[PDB]
């Protein structure tokens, strides 16, 4: 009689309703961490590790979900990390609301493909509107757009200070790592900025290092811990007694040769370590290791030798100091060369104390003047969140420099769309005007949620905002009310251009595209079949 | 049916196992009792699960089947059939059981030929009618000339008994059956011939009591033997009469009145006994118990009194003494008395019984049954009951048929000769009816150990060309003349075997679907 | 949302399914707003404002007639029956039951008490085999020895409704009869038989050819009555004896000492028929019968049960229509017009009320929507047409049942009492005001 | 969701919601159709004279082989809410008419089966039900066009015997095809009230005893009761009975109230004992003074009365049951006398031969009053070779009694053998295209469903359904539609008038009406709320 599949079959309104609730269950989390007035979350795992954060993507990736419609929103946040860099809260809020309002349409006997078509049309039109209502590029604002963008993002984090202490470190660290390339690509590889943590001094004693902070130690307490005008030898082979290879055996028939052959195991090694120092090298950096025999030669020579560092770190040091990585011996059938001219430079290499720990700094480097930042917190909980907050701010500034266009914050862009799109619905409104209107109405969740989290007036504060954006479009007197948002600290509108509240254009253009497509996929899961799990075979 | 079941705790079988299990379960009944058919069959012992297991040894199919406990809902159909045969005529219970089973066996074979079950039933109806005529046209009548009639009763009694424990005692128990019935000269009550079972002696030592035996020995202070006694039977109260006023108390000012009333209580009991004694009696039997006070009064009068011989004992005494129940005594001149010669007690099996000998109008008798063991006594008693039941009907319907398979071959002949005049669609079913009829003389020979391959062929060949009295000679293992040998059966017994097997067998053929309700009280 | 149906069952009689759905929609329309502030006090204020406006408008648009005590009023009641019997397990028998319902109520006195109309179910027959009986009937309760006699053919019997015992055992449970003689023994035995016969002779010589009692009537009385050409039936329940008294125009007497022709009932036909296979004892023919009985026939218990309910609904609707002739169009017609008035009202008031009074008005669409979604009819486009027609023309536009289009329910005579919607609005809004006013719930852990 | 809200709290609406079962959708309609197919197929093989019977095994082990649908279905442990209603349909037909215990189930099944493809086409469940009613009226109006009989219920009972043969032809007692048909005719016509057309089946008693054969079934113009003579030597034959019927026990009168007789003196003790001995003379002589020679007593006798019955040659029976003493009074025309002192000759019953019937070796010796004058009560005595045939024969005769009563109430008849069903199916088809407004699909589906009966009859008769219906139906449109049916042996031609296959008009009228309503009330459902576990 019934389907002979050993699982469960659920169709129609059963799965369609569950899909929306699963999306809402996730949205109910992130809506509470929207805007500078949001509060932090605490997550505790089964074994007792406590994590505190206000990053939407970190939170969602840590929380376990079961329903496949909830996993989509978790992936949606991951897309923002790759494509945008700071949009990990609003992308889920927008997508969930599109699903809720879409459900209300299809329950009225409106075919799902009529809603999907309208959503795609309105989304494409919304992007067109945004690209015609931009504020300014980054040439007239100069530095102001970079400090403003840095502070706008950080306003939502534990380091959201009113001052410019952090903002200056963010902007200057990004600008100091400018790399040119062919076809006009002013690269800003912010991933090269080394961020360190220490449970130590207050937030206001963070260091901005010109050079590179190397997370290692000198080790043997007989080497110099401060070298001025250093030559840096960056190499990737081990300094140890030389072992025989598995395919080669030492078989001796004359006992008199035992001492010369045995001794060679240490002589062939010491011949090499003398020649990397005979070039004048002062700081020797290896990703492998240095045994007890070899350490003597650096101490006696007055050289610094740092062992067991990461390959990703040495490559960054060599590029910043002008050194070449040498792993073996070469140079035109030469036996031992060590490429004497390929040493790097630094004005100073020093090991310092960073609140009961040791850190090696390579200062100024004289080739690329890389950057590192050492963050200070009262405890581990603050330090972990500060690292994430700094990374976000570094990424936002990168986006401003790459895409020379900003849009207003404070909900101004969404308010402008909530008027334009409603009028758009009246031009092409034959059958999809319900989907277009609901697409536009879904956008108001942002100024609505912001008012709630700030404990401000709701339906009156946002309604007043919309009145200003309405007049700009129905009274074409160039009133320039399109850049007005909400001031969550006073409960009044503000001009976001004079207040300096800027966001990269891509933070909203990309979010609308990805949030819309994610919802459309979920809106086509009317049927679900689930099979019995295989546990014991 | 097994797909999309909408039953609570019930199940059903259709067209596949419904008929298969019905035929297997029902036909098995025939094989159970098959071994008891004929004069050379073996007997069964039936055992209980315990709790006074009450072991029974028996031959008769009815006593076997009624104690099995058949659970199969289709097999129960034939069990009830064998009950009816036992209740109606009291003989042939094995023959009707195995005949119905053989008919059903053939029906399963006919279904295998893809013959519609309604065609099979229709064929058996026509074959049954053919067999009924064979019995009607072959009946033997007996009217007057009593020297020939009595011989018929001896033949019927001998035939029935030959199949039971009382095999080599025929020269004693044949007369006990025929003469006991002839002495009744009246209604076939089947209670006027009482059997008393005693251990001691052999079966050949049983005898017929010309008079009537009573239990409950002759009193305490009463004569033990009176010659030419007048017998009075009664169904009245001896003491605690509590005459017909419900809710009456004696309420007096002193105990002197209680003593005076107590004397009056006994004076009326004295008068009551005197009113009975004015009848002029020697022997008094009362259904109700006799108390110390009337016992002295009857003793002083020289009159014996028996208490509670049995519930129906007084009714039986009325028939064998020629009197009346006499539950009330207020007109002695309207009360009839009986008469006998001796009222002496006799010793039978170390037990003193009251013997009423020489009783006038004695339309009753008692058989004294002796045996070595209790199993012998119980089976021998049943043999007497079975023979008396048939004889009580033979004396009412004198029509008989020839036994030894003669009647069965005559019925099979009529069915065969007419089946060959019918179209094949139905003839195949009529022939199967005749084949079942011929299984009965085959089973009889097979139980004895005779070469049935030749006895059946010779008997059929005989009846094919006259020889309408030919049958099985179970002594030599050949074919003989039933009239000369004296092997006959009651017409009514044979008629019912034919009709009952046919009617019962149809019940199974008509069913294609069994629906079994959820059981109760099974955990 | 269940308790409000209990109240509507008492106040309206059929306001059931509609009040639960409307109350649910009142909450749904405000659901997206109550999650973001919106102090509960202003929600209650808006609910009360819109509620009072809606019920006032109904009174201003309901229609009445001036043709009382005429065939026009009887026809009005039949129109109400057509909508009362709608949405029941009735296909072509609407006019069959309606004609009986309208007359069954109009034949009542000026109390129109519902206890004067009895409905009894008899298995067997179709809906169209039911019959309306002028008088009463009962199911022929436990019979005694002799009830196979007493012929059931009477053309002008009188009816004695008694509460007297007619058994031999006239015992008071406390009597001890102390007897000292045999002459007195028999005198007491004869007295017990004389007491029974004295009562029986007092019942006789009255013309009461039919005698009925709630108490036992024994075998001796059955045989006495049979030979004296009288019919009896005892153990009749008081519920039927009360109706019988009002149907036959007599009285119920307890003592037999005061019986006469002035307390007996009268009818023309007293017979026991075989409707449904079982025997049923009918009275009919009394011209002064203040009650009636409706015998339902059908092919199943559940089939008849649903029929009985449809008869209770129709009786209640036409009863109220007799006393209150103010009616409105049925379907969703009035709901579209009420939403029009409320929307015009709300759009003239500034402030937060615009999101609350309008939400109340929007909830009123659930009726024409559900009246379409349950059978197709393209509910979206039907609503689009209704909102355009109600803005230009009449106020009674609803959804047709035959064609998938709009029709004027007033010209189609799809009418219901105005109080149906006034009461439904009151309860639905009252429930909404109670639900949104709760902030905390406490559950005791004890369950025993 | 249930047991989970958006905020992580449990979501509980109804008690034990996690252990309920709920289905609406379109699958509730499919489930109802599936259950209906199981019921219709169950009885399909027991339709018509060539159908086969079922063996029903009761919960207590009793086994009955049944032909009638009412017993077949009533003994099934059905666990489905709609299947039980289909059982109730058969019950209603058994109560109203007593014939179509299978027909209403097979017909209702076909209507529900056709609903399957009608629903698949997208036809609203209500439209299907409404179309069936619209077409049902056409079949009914056509059914009433063809009917005629000349039964007068006096002497020309030939067409009435033929009707009884048709009714009994499908039963297990065909060996008495004629004998039992005539018994049923005489049983009803001698008790029915021809002046009002009222038939009271309480006047026809059904008795039986295991033993004998079906050919021994007799109609007794009188009563059969359990024998229990007060005295064992009473005569076995009464030549001319004058019957005194009492419900007073044969014992001195006792008061019904608390008594407690006071006895003080010896004169009181002896006198009371004397007075009581004189009272037994009165209760007996008061019977003889009326000329009575047979007493009927609901109560027992005391010992002293038993002897007095002998002295006065007054036979009597004791402990006669409730309906037995009432039946004797009706059959003999007498009255029950409350007391002995109220006895009078005017209240005596009049009867002729009274004797006992002995059965085999049993001790029952039932007492029968065989001769009577203008009795309005009869007894039918059923015999048989086993319990199985007897109990079914009792029900088979009941059907024969019902169809006679049905003709007495309404003497309009129709032709059977499928002729009435095929003719109605053709009539609906002719109007189905006049006019196909909206419901063309339902009007044709109804007409096809009407043919489920002659097709199932063809299958049970071994014929090819679609080949048989093609030939039969074609003959009925080529000529002025004659009443053609089907059979297994064909009996020459298939003219139902010459085969004498007679059925009642009101029977089939009710089969159509009851099936039509039952189908509607089980299609117009979209919610199944069966509970789950019992605890």
3-state SS record for A453-491: HCCCCCHHHHHHHHHHHHHHHHCCCCCCCCCEEEECCCC
**Active-site annotation holds for A55:** yes
**What are the two backbone dihedrals, phi and then psi, of residue A69, each rounded to the nearest 5 degrees?**
-75, -20
Structure tokens at D99: 């014939």
| DSSP H/E element including D367 | strand D366-369
DSSP for D252-279, written as a single string = ----SSB--EEE-SHHHHHHHHHHHHHH
Resolution as reported, in Å: 4.5
Q: For residue A204, what is the DSSP state?
A: G
Chains meeting B at 3+ CB pairs closer than 8 A? D
- The rounded distance, in Å, linking the Cα atoms of C79 and C76 is 5
* Angstroms from C330 CA to nearest CA on chain D: 21
Helix boundaries (H) for D190-302: 266-288
| Residue B76 to residue D65: CA distance in whole angstroms | 12
Quote the Cα angle for B99-B103-B106, to 5°: 140
Question: What is the C-alpha to C-alpha distance for residues A459 and C36, in angstroms, rounded to an integer?
Answer: 8
Nearest-10 Cα torsion for C445, D2, D6, D7: 20
Contacts of C378 in chain A (CB under 8 A): 109
Which of B90, B117, B327 has the CB atom closest to D52's CB atom?
B117
Interface A-C: count of C-beta contacts within 8 A: 22
Distance CA D94, CA D77 (A): 20
Q: Note whether A437 and A186 are within 8 A (CB).
A: no
Tell me if A18 and D7 make a contact (CB, 8 A cut-off). no
| CA C94 – CA C81 distance, rounded (Å) | 8
CA distance to partner chain A, nearest, from residue D148 (Å): 48
Query: Which of C55, C281, C58, C46 minimizes the C-alpha distance to C154?
Result: C281
Q: Give per-residue burial for C193-230: e unless 16+ CB within 10 Å, then b.
A: beebeebbeebbebebbbbbbbeebbbbbbbbbbeeeb
> Which residues of B fall within a CB distance of 8 Å from D308?
328
Q: Which two tokens stand for residue C33?
A: 């707003």
Give the C-side interface with A, CB within 8 Å.
33, 36-38, 352, 355, 373, 378-380
CA D118 from centre of chain: 37
The verdict on a CB contact (< 8 Å) between B235 and D78 is no
Burial per residue of B19-56, b for 16 or more beta-carbon CB atoms within 10 angstroms, e otherwise? bebbbebbbebbebbbbbbbbbbeebeeeeeeeeeeeb
- Annotated binding residue A302: no
How many Cβ atoms are within 10 Å of C364's Cβ, its own excluded?
26
Q: Do D247 and C277 touch (CB under 8 A)?
A: no
Residues 262-281 of B with CB under 8 A from D: 264-265, 268
Kindly report whether the peptide bond that precedes residue D528 is cis, defined as omega within 30 degrees of 0. Answer: no
Closest in C36, C378, C380 to A452, CB measured: C36
CA B313 – CA B234 distance, rounded (Å): 11
Paired strand residues for B514: B13, D55
3 state SS of C347: coil
CA D178 vs CA A114, A494, B130, B220, D413: distances in Å: 76, 109, 20, 69, 21
Residue D258, min C-alpha distance to chain C (Å): 5
Report the b/e string of D68-82 with b at 16+ CB within 10 A: bbbbbbebbebebeb
Helix (H) or strand (E) holding A75: helix A68-83
Helix (H) or strand (E) holding D477: helix D465-478
Nearest by Cα to C221 from C146, C142, C141:
C146
Query: What Å distances lie between residue A46 and A59, B359, B475, CA to CA?
Result: 16, 110, 99
Using DSSP, state whether A376 is helix, strand or coil: strand
Contact call for residues C32 and C48 (beta carbons, < 8 A) = no
C–D: how many Cβ contacts below 8 A?
107
Residues for chain A: how many in total?
A: 537
In this structure, what DSSP letter does residue D437 have?
S
| Partners of A485 in beta bridges | A494
Nearest to D6 among A1, A12, A24 (CB): A24
How many degrees, rounded to 5, is the angle at CA C273 between CA C268 and CA C279? 130
Q: Are D371 and D314 in contact (CB under 8 A)?
A: no
Inter-chain residue contact D65 with B80, CB threshold 8 Å: no
D65 in Cβ contact with D55 (< 8 Å): yes
Query: Distance between CA atoms of A505 and A514, rounded to whole angstroms?
Result: 15
Q: Write out chain A residues lying below 8 Å of D7, CB-based.
A: 28
Q: Are D132 and D516 in contact (CB under 8 A)?
A: yes
A-chain residue closest to C351, CA distance: A460
Instruction: Tell me the CA end-to-end span of chain B in Å, nearest whole number.
Output: 26
Is A108's Cβ below 8 Å from some Cβ in C? yes
Q: Which of residues 6-35 of A touch C (CB under 8 A)?
A: none
D524 touches chain B (CB under 8 A): no
What part of B 20-79 touches D (C-beta under 8 Å)?
A: 22, 73-74, 76-77
Block residue for tokens 């470190």: A169
Burial D174-199 (b: 16+ CB within 10 A, else e): bbbeebbbbbbbebbbbbbeeeeebb
Residue C187 in contact with partner chain D when CB distance is under 8 A: no
> CB-based burial of residue A140 (10 Å sphere; 0-12 exposed, 13-18 middle, 19+ buried)?
exposed
Which structural domains are found in chain B, ordered by start?
Answer: 11-141+398-518 (1.10.560.10), 142-216+355-397 (3.30.260.10), 217-354 (3.50.7.10)
Q: Who's near A164: CB < 8 A, 6+ residues apart? A: A147, A151
- The verdict on a CB contact (< 8 Å) between D25 and A25 is no
Enumerate the active-site residues of D.
Answer: 68, 101-102, 399
* A380 part of the active site: no
Experimentally determined by: cryo-EM
**What is the CATH topology of the domain spanning C68-134+321-327?**
GROEL; domain 2 (3.30.260)
Examine the residue annotation and report whether A537 is marked as an active-site residue of this protein.
Answer: no
| Given the residues A53, A58, A81, A88, the one annotated as active site | A88
**Pairing between β-strand B248-250 and β-strand D261-263 as defined by DSSP bridges:** parallel
Measured in whole angstroms, the distance separating CA D501 from the mean position of its chain's CA atoms is 21
Report the C-alpha gap between D53 and D46 in whole angstroms: 6
Cβ neighbors of A521 (< 8 A, separation 6 or more) are A72
Residues in A closer than 8 angstroms to C379, CB to CB, are: 108-109
CB B122: neighbour CB atoms within 10 A? 16
Residues 478-507 of D with CB under 8 A from B: none
DSSP D340: S
Relative to beta strand A226-235, strand A406-408 is unpaired
Restricting to D residues 346-385, those with a Cβ less than 8 Å away from any Cβ of B are 360-362, 384-385
Cα–Cα dist A480/C15, whole Å: 56
Task: Please judge whether C355 and A459 are an interchain contact, meaning their C-beta atoms are less than 8 angstroms apart.
Answer: yes
- CB neighbours of residue D233 within 10 Å: 13
CATH 3.20.20.140 fits A208-402, yes or no: no
CATH class of C137-320: alpha beta
């Amino acid at each position: 009689g019934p389907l002979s599949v050993f699982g469960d079959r659920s169709t129609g309104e059963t799965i369609r309703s569950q899909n929306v609730m699963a999306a809402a269950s996730i949205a109910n989390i992130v809506k509470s961490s929207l805007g500078p007035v949001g509060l932090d979350k605490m997550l505790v795992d089964d074994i007792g590790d406590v994590t505190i954060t206000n990053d939407g993507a970190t939170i969602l990736k840590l929380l376990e979900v079961e329903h496949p419609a909830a996993k989509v929103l978790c992936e949606l946040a991951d897309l923002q990390d790759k494509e945008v860099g700071d949009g990990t809260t609003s992308v889920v809020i927008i997508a969930a609301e599109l699903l809720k309002n879409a459900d209300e349409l299809v329950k009225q006997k409106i075919h799902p493909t009529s809603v999907i078509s309208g959503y795609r049309l309105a989304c494409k039109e919304a992007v067109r509107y945004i690209n015609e209502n931009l504020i300014v590029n980054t040439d007239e604002l100069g530095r102001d757009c970079l400090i403003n963008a840095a502070k706008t993002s950080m306003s939502s984090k534990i380091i959201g200070i009113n001052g410019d202490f952090f903002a200056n470190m963010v902007v200057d660290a990004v600008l100091a790592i400018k790399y040119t390339d062919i076809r006009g690509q002013p690269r800003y590889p912010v991933n090269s900025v080394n961020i360190l943590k220490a449970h130590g001094r207050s937030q206001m004693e963070s260091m901005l290092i010109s050079g590179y902070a190397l997370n290692c130690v000198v080790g043997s307490q007989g080497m110099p811990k401060r070298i001025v005008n250093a030559k840096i030898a960056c190499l990737d082979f081990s300094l140890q007694k030389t072992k025989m290879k598995l395919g080669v055996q030492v078989v001796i028939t004359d006992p008199e040769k035992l001492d010369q052959i045995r001794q060679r195991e240490s002589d062939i090694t010491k011949e090499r370590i003398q020649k990397i120092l005979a070039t004048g090298a002062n700081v020797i950096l290896t990703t492998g290791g240095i045994d007890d025999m070899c350490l003597k030669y650096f101490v006696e020579a007055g050289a610094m030798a740092v062992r067991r560092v990461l390959k990703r770190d040495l490559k960054r040091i060599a590029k910043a100091s002008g050194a070449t990585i040498l792993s073996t011996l070469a140079n035109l059938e030469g036996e031992e060369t060590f490429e004497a001219a390929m040493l790097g430079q630094a004005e100073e290499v020093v090991q310092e104390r960073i609140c009961d720990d040791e850190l090696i700094l390579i200062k100024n480097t004289k080739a690329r003047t890389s950057a590192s930042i050492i963050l200070r917190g009262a405890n581990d909980f603050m330090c972990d969140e500060m690292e994430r907050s700094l990374h976000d701010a570094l990424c936002v500034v990168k986006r401003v420099l790459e895409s020379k266009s900003v849009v207003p914050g404070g909900g101004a862009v969404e308010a402008a769309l909530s008027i334009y799109l409603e009028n758009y619905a009246t031009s092409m409104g034959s059958r999809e005007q319900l989907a277009i209107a609901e697409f536009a109405r879904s956008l108001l969740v942002i100024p609505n949620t912001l008012a709630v989290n700030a404990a401000q007036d709701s339906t009156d504060l946002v309604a007043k905002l919309r009145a200003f954006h309405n007049e700009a479009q129905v009274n074409p007197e160039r009133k320039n009310l399109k850049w007005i948002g909400l001031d969550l600290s006073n409960g009044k509108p503000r001009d976001n251009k004079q207040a300096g509240v800027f966001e990269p254009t891509i933070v909203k253009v990309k979010s609308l595209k990805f949030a819309t497509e994610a919802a459309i996929t979920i809106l086509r899961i009317d049927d679900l079949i689930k099979l019995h799990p295989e546990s014991k075979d | 049916a097994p797909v999309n079941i909408f039953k609570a705790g019930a199940d059903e079988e259709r067209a596949e196992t419904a008929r298969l299990t019905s035929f297997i379960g029902a036909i098995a009944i025939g094989d159970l009792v098959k071994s008891t058919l004929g004069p050379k069959g073996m007997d069964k012992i039936l055992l209980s699960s315990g709790r006074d297991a009450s072991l029974m040894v028996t031959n008769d199919g009815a006593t076997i089947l009624k104690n099995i406990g058949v659970d199969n809902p289709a097999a129960k159909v034939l069990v009830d059939m064998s009950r009816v045969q036992d209740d109606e005529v009291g003989d042939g219970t094995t023959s009707v059981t195995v005949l119905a089973a053989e008919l059903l066996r053939e029906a399963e074979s006919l279904i295998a030929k893809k013959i519609h079950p309604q065609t099979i039933i229709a064929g058996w109806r026509e074959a049954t009618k053919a067999a009924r005529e064979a019995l009607l046209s072959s009946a033997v009548d007996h009217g007057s000339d009593e020297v020939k009639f009595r011989q018929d009763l001896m033949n019927i009694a001998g035939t029935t008994l030959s199949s039971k424990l009382l095999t080599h005692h025929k020269d004693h128990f044949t007369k006990l059956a025929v003469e006991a019935v002839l002495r009744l000269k009246g209604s076939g009550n089947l209670e006027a011939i009482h059997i008393i079972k005693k251990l001691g002696g052999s079966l050949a030592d049983s005898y017929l009591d010309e008079g009537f035996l009573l239990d409950k020995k002759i009193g305490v202070n009463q004569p033990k033997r009176i010659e030419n006694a007048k017998i009075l039977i009664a169904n009245t109260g001896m003491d605690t009469d509590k005459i017909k006023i419900f809710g009456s108390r004696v309420r007096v000012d002193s105990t002197a009145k209680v003593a005076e009333i107590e004397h009056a209580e006994k004076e009326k009991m004295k008068e009551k006994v005197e009113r009975i004694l004015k009848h002029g009696i020697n022997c008094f039997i009362n259904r109700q118990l006799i108390y110390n006070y009337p016992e002295q009064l009857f003793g002083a009068a020289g009159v014996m009194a028996i208490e509670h011989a049995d519930f129906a004992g007084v009714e039986r005494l009325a028939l064998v003494t020629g009197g009346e129940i006499a539950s009330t005594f207020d007109h002695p001149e309207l009360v009839k008395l009986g008469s006998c010669k001796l009222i002496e007690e006799v010793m039978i099996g170390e037990d003193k019984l009251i013997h009423f000998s020489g009783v006038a109008l004695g339309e009753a008798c008692t058989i004294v049954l002796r045996g070595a063991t209790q199993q012998i006594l119980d089976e021998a008693e049943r043999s007497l009951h079975d023979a008396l039941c048939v004889l009580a009907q033979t004396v009412k319907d004198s029509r008989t048929v020839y036994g030894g398979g003669c009647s069965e071959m005559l019925m099979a002949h009529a069915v065969t000769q007419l089946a060959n005049r019918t179209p094949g669609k139905e003839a195949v079913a009529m022939e199967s009816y005749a084949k079942a009829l011929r299984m009965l003389p085959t089973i009889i020979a097979d139980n004895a150990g005779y070469d049935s391959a030749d006895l059946v062929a010779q008997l059929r060949a005989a009846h094919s060309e006259g020889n309408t009295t030919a049958g099985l000679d179970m002594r030599e293992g050949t074919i003989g003349d039933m009239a000369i040998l004296g092997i006959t059966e009651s017409f009514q017994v044979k008629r019912q075997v034919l009709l009952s097997a046919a009617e019962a067998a149809e019940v199974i053929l008509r069913v294609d679907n069994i629906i079994k309700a959820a059981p109760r009280k099974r955990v | 949302l269940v308790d409000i149906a209990k109240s509507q069952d008492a106040e309206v009689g059929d306001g059931t399914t509609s009040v639960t759905l409307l109350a649910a929609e009142f909450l749904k329309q405000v659901k997206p707003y109550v999650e973001e502030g919106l102090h509960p006090q202003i929600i209650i204020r808006a609910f009360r404002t819109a509620t009072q406006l809606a019920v006032n408008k109904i009174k201003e648009i309901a229609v009445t007639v001036k043709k009382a005590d005429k065939v026009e009023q009887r026809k009005l009641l039949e129109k109400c029956a057509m909508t009362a019997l709608s949405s029941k397990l009735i296909s072509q028998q609407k006019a069959f039951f309606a004609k009986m319902v309208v007359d069954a109520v109009m034949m009542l006195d000026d109390l129109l008490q519902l206890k004067m109309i009895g409905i009894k179910k008899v298995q067997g027959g179709a809906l169209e085999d039911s019959q309306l009986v002028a008088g009463v009937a009962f199911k022929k309760t436990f019979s005694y020895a002799g009830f196979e006699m007493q012929p059931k053919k009477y053309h002008n019997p009188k009816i004695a409704l008694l509460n007297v015992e007619l058994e031999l055992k006239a015992e008071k449970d406390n009597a001890e009869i102390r007897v000292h003689t045999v002459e007195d023994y028999q005198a007491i035995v004869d007295a017990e038989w004389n007491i029974l016969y004295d009562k029986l002779e007092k019942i006789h010589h009255s013309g009461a050819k039919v005698v009925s009692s709630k108490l036992p009537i024994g075998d001796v009385a059955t045989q006495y009555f049979a030979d004296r050409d009288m019919f009896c039936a005892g153990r009749v329940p008081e519920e039927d004896l009360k109706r019988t008294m009002m149907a036959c125009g007599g009285s119920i007497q307890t003592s037999v000492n005061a019986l006469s022709a002035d307390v007996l009932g009268r009818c023309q036909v007293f017979e026991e028929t075989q409707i449904g296979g079982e025997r049923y004892n009918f009275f009919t023919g009394c011209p002064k019968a203040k009650t009636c009985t409706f015998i339902l026939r059908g092919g199943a218990e559940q089939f008849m049960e649903e029929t009985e309910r449809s008869l209770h609904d129709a009786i209640m609707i036409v009863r109220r229509a007799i006393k209150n002739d103010s009616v409105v169009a049925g379907g969703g017609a009035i709901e579209m017009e009420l939403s029009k008035y409320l929307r015009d009202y709300s759009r003239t008031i500034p402030g937060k009320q615009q999101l609350l009074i309008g939400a109340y008005a929007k909830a009123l669409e659930i009726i024409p929507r559900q009246l379409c979604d349950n059978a197709g009819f393209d509910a979206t486009n039907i609503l689009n047409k209704l909102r355009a027609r109600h803005a230009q023309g009449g106020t009674w536009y609803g959804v047709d049942i035959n064609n998938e289009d709009i029709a004027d329910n007033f010209e189609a005579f799809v009418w219901e009492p105005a109080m149906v919607r006034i009461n439904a609005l009151t309860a639905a809004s009252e429930a909404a005001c109670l639900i949104v006013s709760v902030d905390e719930t406490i559950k005791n852990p004890r369950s025993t | 969701t249930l047991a989970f809200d958006e905020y992580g709290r449990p979501f509980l609406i109804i008690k034990d919601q996690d252990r309920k079962s709920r289905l609406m959708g379109l699958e509730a309609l499919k489930s109802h159709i599936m259950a209906a197919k199981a019921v219709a197929n169950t009885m399909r093989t027991s339709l018509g004279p060539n159908g086969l019977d079922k063996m029903m095994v009761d919960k207590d082990g009793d086994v009955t082989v049944t032909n009638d649908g009412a017993t077949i279905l009533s003994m099934m442990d059905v666990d489905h809410q709609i299947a039980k209603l289909m059982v109730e349909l058969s019950k209603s037909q058994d109560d109203e008419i007593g014939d179509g215990t299978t027909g209403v189930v097979v017909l209702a099944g076909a209507l529900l089966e056709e609903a399957e493809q009608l629903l698949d086409r997208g036809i609203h469940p209500i439209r299907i039900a409404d179309g069936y009613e619209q077409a049902a009226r056409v079949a009914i109006e056509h059914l009433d066009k063809i009917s005629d009989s000349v039964l007068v219920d006096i002497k020309d009972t030939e067409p009435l015997i033929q009707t009884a043969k048709t009714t009994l032809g499908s039963k297990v007692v065909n060996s008495c095809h004629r004998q039992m048909a005539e018994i049923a005719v005489n049983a009803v016509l001698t008790v029915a009230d021809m002046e009002r057309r009222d038939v009271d089946f309480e006047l026809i008693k059904v008795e039986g005893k295991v033993g004998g054969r079906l050919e021994d079934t007799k109609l007794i113009k009188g009563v059969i009761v359990d024998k229990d003579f007060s005295h064992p030597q009473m005569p076995k034959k009464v030549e001319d009975a004058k019957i005194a019927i009492l419900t007073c026990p044969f014992e001195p009168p006792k008061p019904k109230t608390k008594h407690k007789l006071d006895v003080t003196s010896v004169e009181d003790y002896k006198a009371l004992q004397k007075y009581e001995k004189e009272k037994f003379e009165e209760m007996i002589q008061q019977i003889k003074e009326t000329g009575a020679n047979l007493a009927i007593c609901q109560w027992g006798f005391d010992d002293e009365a038993n002897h007095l019955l002998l002295q006065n040659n007054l036979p009597a029976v004791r402990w006669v049951g409730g309906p037995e003493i009432e039946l004797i009074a009706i059959a003999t025309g007498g009255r029950i006398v409350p007391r002995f002192s109220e006895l009078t000759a005017e209240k005596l019953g009049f009867a002729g031969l009274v004797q006992e019937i002995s059965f085999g070796t049993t001790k029952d010796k039932m007492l029968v009053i065989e001769q009577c004058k203008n009795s309005r009560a009869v007894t039918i005595f059923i015999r048989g070779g086993n319990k199985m045939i007897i109990e079914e024969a009792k029900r088979s005769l009941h059907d024969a009694l019902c169809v006679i009563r049905n003709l007495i109430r309404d003497n309009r008849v129709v032709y059977g053998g499928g002729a009435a069903e095929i003719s109605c199916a053709l009539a609906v088809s002719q109007e189905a295209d006049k006019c196909p407004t909206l419901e063309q699909y339902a009007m044709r589906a109804f007409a096809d469903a009407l043919e489920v009966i002659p097709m199932a009859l063809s299958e049970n008769s071994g014929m090819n359904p679609i080949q048989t219906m093609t030939e039969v139906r074609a003959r009925q449109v080529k000529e002025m539609n004659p009443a053609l049916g089907i059979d297994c042996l064909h009996k020459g031609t298939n003219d139902m008038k010459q085969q004498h296959v007679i059925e009642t008009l009101i029977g089939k009228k009710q089969q159509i009406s009851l099936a039509t309503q039952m189908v509607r009330m089980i299609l117009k459902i979209d919610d199944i709320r069966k509970p789950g576990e019992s605890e």
